[PDB]
Design a protein around this ligand. Structure first.
Ligand code: 38O
Length: 293
C-alpha cells in the first residue's frame, strides 16, 4: 500500500553508519548515534515508528518535522539535518549533543551541586529557547529535564531543547495524549483539563530550576496519587534544610512559576528580566551610570 516520501533507507545506510551508542528508547521511538561516512561528523538518528496502537501516524510525524523545521533557526533548539524513511519508520537525522540530558545534573546521587553561575546560565538559555517557541505560537508541553540536552558536560556546554512530539498551538484542547505524559512533570491545568497555554511550559521551567538547585523532584510522591495531590495542591518542599544553600532570588524565581493558576505565572520574556538572572561577567569592564565626563 503506502508510498514513501522521504529519502530512501538505501541512501541512509550509504551515507551513515550507526554506532553502538544507543541514546534513548521509548514505546514508538529509538535514538541511536550515527556518523557521516564522508565527514566523520556525529549525529543522533531518531527512528520513529509510523504505526501506533493501530493508527497510521505519518501525519503526526510530518507535523513534528514541520515544527522542528520552523524552530531550526533558534540555537537553543535541536537542529534537524536530514530525514529518511523505510516501511515502518521515519528517521530524523538530528544534532548530536555530547553532554546528554540536563537530568544528569539533577540526580540525588550526583555529589557536585552545579554552581549558581551555571544554573543561572542554563536557566537563561532554556528561557531564550522557550521565548523563541512562544513567539512562534509553539507550546512544547513536555519540557521535562530528559528533553533538554547539553552540547557538553566538561566543560559545561549549551542547551538544546528536543522532542516536539507533544507540541501544540496556544489554546488547543487538553486531550488524551496530554493527560498521558510523565506524571511528576504535568502542570495543574493539564490534570484539570484546562486548555493549553504557554504557562504550562513556564511551570516546567520552575521544576527544572528546582531540580537543578535541590537534586529532588518537587512533586513526585509515595504513589501517583500523592504525585497528583502534590501537583494539584502545589505542595512543594521549601524547607530551610532543602533551601539553606539556595539563594532567595532563586527561591523567588521558582515560587513565581510553581503556582496553581497558569495566568499568574510570568511569561518567558518577563522571566528573562528576573533579578536572579541579572549577572555581570567579572571579566568585562562595567560602564557605570556616573561617566567620566
Ligand atoms: C560521557 N557522555 C555521557 C552522556 N552521553 C549521552 C547520553 C545520552 C544522549 N542522548 C543524546 C541525544 C539525544 N537523546 C537526542 C534526542 F533524543 C533527540 C534529538 C537529538 C538528540 N541528540 C542527542 O545527542 N546525546 C547523548 C549523550 C554521552 C557520553
Amino acid at each position: 500500500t503506502e508510498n514513501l516520501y522521504f529519502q530512501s533507507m538505501e541512501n541512509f545506510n550509504n551515507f551513515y553508519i550507526l554506532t553502538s551508542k544507543e541514546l534513548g528508547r521509548g514505546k514508538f521511538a529509538v535514538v541511536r548515534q550515527c556518523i557521516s561516512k564522508s565527514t566523520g561528523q556525529e549525529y543522533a538518528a531518531k527512528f520513529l515508528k509510523k504505526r501506533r496502537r493501530g493508527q497510521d501516524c505519518r501525519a503526526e510525524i510530518l507535523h513534528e518535522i514541520a515544527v522542528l523545521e520552523l524552530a531550526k533557526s533558534c540555537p537553543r533548539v535541536i537542529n534537524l539535518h536530514e530525514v529518511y524513511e523505510n516501511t515502518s519508520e521515519i528517521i530524523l537525522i538530528l544534532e548530536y549533543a555530547a553532554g546528554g540530558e540536563i537530568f544528569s545534573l539533577c540526580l540525588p546521587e550526583l555529589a557536585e551541586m552545579v554552581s549558581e553561575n551555571d544554573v543561572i546560565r542554563l536557566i537563561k538559555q532554556i528561557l531564550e529557547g522557550v521565548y523563541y517557541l512562544h513567539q512562534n505560537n509553539i507550546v512544547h508541553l513536555d519540557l521535562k529535564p530528559q528533553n533538554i540536552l547539553l552540547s557538553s558536560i566538561y566543560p559545561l556546554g549549551d542547551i538544546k531543547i528536543v522532542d516536539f512530539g507533544m507540541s501544540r498551538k496556544i489554546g488547543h484542547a487538553c486531550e488524551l495524549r496530554e493527560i498521558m505524559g510523565t506524571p511528576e512533570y504535568l502542570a495543574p491545568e493539564i490534570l484539570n483539563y484546562d486548555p493549553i497555554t504557554t504557562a504550562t511550559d513556564m511551570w516546567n521551567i520552575g521544576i527544572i530550576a528546582y531540580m537543578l538547585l535541590t537534586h529532588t523532584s518537587p512533586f513526585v510522591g509515595e504513589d501517583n496519587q500523592e504525585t497528583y495531590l502534590n501537583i494539584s495542591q502545589v505542595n512543594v518542599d521549601y524547607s530551610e534544610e532543602t533551601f539553606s544553600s539556595v539563594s532567595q532570588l532563586a527561591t523567588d524565581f521558582i515560587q513565581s512559576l510553581l503556582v496553581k493558576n497558569p495566568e499568574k505565572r510570568p511569561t518567558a520574556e518577563i522571566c528573562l528580566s528576573h533579578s536572579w538572572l541579572q549577572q555581570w561577567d567579572f571579566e568585562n569592564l562595567f560602564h557605570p551610570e556616573e561617566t567620566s565626563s
